């Protein structure tokens, strides 16, 4: 029932959806473009994971306007989802410490 945990879970499922949609749409956006490397779905999912975690190796990246806009959506969704998990951990710790000191 606690809001922070349900929001964390929601953010997790939303992130999975964004990774899958970003993989699909990045391929869709990049295949028009000579030299583009983000053009098959298995490595595009890998790219979407590294973009969502900000763990970005430089092995793949978009070169088109629409692929970069897809990238921005994946970045913000990833950073926001992990920040939400952090915030829920803090809420849990704060509650448990209020209990441990009897408040």
């Amino acid at each position: 029932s606690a809001l922070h945990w349900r929001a964390a879970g929601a953010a997790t499922v939303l992130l999975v959806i964004v990774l899958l949609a970003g993989s699909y749409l990045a391929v869709l956006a990049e295949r028009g473009a000579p030299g583009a490397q983000l053009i098959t779905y298995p490595r595009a999912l890998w790219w979407s994971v590294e973009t969502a975690t900000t763990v970005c190796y430089g092995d793949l990246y978009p070169v088109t306007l629409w692929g970069r806009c897809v990238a921005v959506v994946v970045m913000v969704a990833g950073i926001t989802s992990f920040g939400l998990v952090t915030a829920a951990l803090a809420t849990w710790f704060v509650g448990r410490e209020q209990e441990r000191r009897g408040h």
Epitope: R31, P34, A36, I39, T40
Partner: antibody
């Protein structure tokens, strides 16, 4: 069952146009691309373009004159290539092929021999 | 756009021999090379994907190797049904491109 079905032949007068078809069976997925490849007698394979039926977007070989226009019909699982204003340079076998979005042509149609003649 | 050079354009071998086809990419493309066989009057047929991975229903004498710019398709003990044109194809960068093809000939 044969995965991609195309007609054996089409006869086209110079300057006219023709719509080739490629009917797909077997598993279909949202990540499927249909490619078209041109082969002139005694020569190699030349990539023409691709279409993703699930979304309808098509891309074309930039290095050659655009004579193709690719479409797809999801209800009939059929991909089409409209070749426009053909000359004898356009006589060839045109293959379709299916790529599961992982970069290789898993399966090819039997090819349509197009002859441009009066 | 990535040029794939297949040289020599014709390979002549004796039955039972091991033969090797060469494909060189104009830039580094990892293992994103695929090989097709086309017999006379036939449509192309995938033999090897991603430089070395087997395809179901392809005789085991076919193998592939290489990474980067240099790729080899090998046949152990050539036989008659292997007489064909052999093409490589890259999927590393848009657009996909094909090599110009190597014909296999048998000296009987």
């Amino acid at each position: 069952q044969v995965q991609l079905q195309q007609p054996g032949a089409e006869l086209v007068k110079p300057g006219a146009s023709v719509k080739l078809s490629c009917k797909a069976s077997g598993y279909t997925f949202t990540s499927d691309w249909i490619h078209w490849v041109k082969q002139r007698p005694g020569h190699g394979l030349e990539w023409i373009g691709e279409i993703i039926p699930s979304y309808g977007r098509a891309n074309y070989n930039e290095k050659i004159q655009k004579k193709a226009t690719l479409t797809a019909d999801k209800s009939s699982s059929t991909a089409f290539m409209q070749l426009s204003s053909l000359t004898s340079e356009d006589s060839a076998v045109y293959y379709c092929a299916r790529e599961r979005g992982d970069g290789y042509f898993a399966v090819w149609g039997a090819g349509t021999t197009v002859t441009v003649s009066s | 756009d990535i040029l794939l050079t297949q040289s020599p354009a014709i390979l002549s071998v004796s039955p039972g021999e091991r033969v090797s086809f060469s494909c060189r990419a104009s830039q580094s493309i990892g293992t994103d090379i695929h090989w097709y066989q086309q017999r006379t009057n036939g449509s192309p047929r995938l033999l090897i994907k991603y430089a070395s991975e087997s395809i179901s229903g392809i005789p085991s004498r076919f193998s592939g190797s290489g990474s980067g710019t240099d790729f080899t398709l090998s046949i152990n003990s050539v036989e008659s049904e292997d007489i064909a044109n052999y093409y490589c194809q890259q999927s590393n960068r848009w657009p996909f491109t094909f090599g110009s093809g190597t014909k296999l000939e048998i000296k009987r």
